[PDB]
Design a protein around this nucleic acid. Structure first.
Length: 163
RNA sequence: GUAA
């Protein structure tokens, strides 16, 4: 809907193919999970710049999956295909300060109040997920667990949702 | 300028 390519699938023959790293963290509290954001907040977006312009300035550092842009408020939310690519953008993109773009972490999944915006992950109690959040976590194309069920300590990348 |  807000994705560049709507119906696409996370498979070998897509050049957008990414693995789904799942790990387990024994320090998380009971019935809690950890989700790494794939969503970037971009502020200072000039009025003349549109969705395609943002996708293209980031292309050297990351393949962009979706852009949601509010030109009036001069910010956008950009989802990239993997955590690694998001981390890559935050270090290496616009180091010179040429573009007026301020790049920070955003949240695409779970409640805002569970997100550490400095490190870009959410420690979420399972009771705060909706039924849809649970479904998307296991069944999403990019991110999620790829069938592995949700249990205490599980760590995955932000799953695609449906909005 | 942290949203759907």
């Amino acid at each position: 809907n807000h994705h560049l390519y709507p119906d696409e699938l996370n498979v070998s023959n897509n050049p957008h193919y990414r693995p789904k790293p799942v790990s387990y963290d024994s320090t998380l509290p009971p019935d809690h999970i950890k989700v790494y954001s794939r969503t970037l907040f971009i502020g200072g977006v000039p009025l003349n710049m549109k969705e395609w312009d943002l996708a293209n300035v980031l292309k050297p550092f990351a393949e962009v999956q979706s852009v949601i842009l509010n030109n009036s408020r001069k910010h956008a939310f950009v989802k990239v295909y993997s955590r690694h690519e998001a981390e890559n953008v935050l270090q290496n993109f616009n180091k010179d300060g040429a573009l007026p773009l301020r790049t920070r972490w955003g949240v695409g999944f779970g409640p805002r109040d569970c997100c550490d915006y400095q490190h870009g992950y959410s420690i979420i109690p399972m009771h705060r997920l909706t039924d849809a959040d649970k479904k998307w976590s296991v069944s999403a194309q990019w991110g999620g667990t790829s069938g592995q069920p949700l249990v205490t300590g599980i760590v995955f990348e932000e799953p695609d949702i449906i909005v």
